Amino acid sequence: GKVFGRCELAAAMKRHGLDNYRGYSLGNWVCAAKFESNFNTQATNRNTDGSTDYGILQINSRWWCNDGRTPGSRNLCNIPCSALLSSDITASVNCAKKIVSDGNGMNAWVAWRNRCKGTDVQAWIRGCRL
Known part of the structure; x- marks a missing residue:
């Protein structure tokens, strides 16, 4: 029943290689999860x-x-x-990488398309230790 913090999730996602994965900077992934x-x-x-x-x-x-x-x-x-x-976010990250890899972009995530796309997504990593 873990609820992550913003920066804690960003660090975990970075450790799992999502920063710039298929051209999507880390803030996109944190924004999507938010x-x-x-x-x-x-x-x-x-x-x-x-x-x-x-x-x-x-x-x-x-x-x-x-x-x-x-x-x-x-x-x-x-x-x-x-x-x-x-x-542990391992399986979620691994499956997210597949989603992107199987043709989709991040448009697969309705919240990314409607609340993150086009915004200053670097705000979601600002001030974090990465």
């Missing part, structure tokens, strides 16, 4: 289409992770969705 889950690793959103969004980046169970419940499941990250609810 507006997807407000940094709560346990965040779960259960949709009416039978899919669920899991964890700090709200990764969806139709294409990305397997929860055994979701119609049309592709499990392209090859993981159980429960791995995305850990206090």
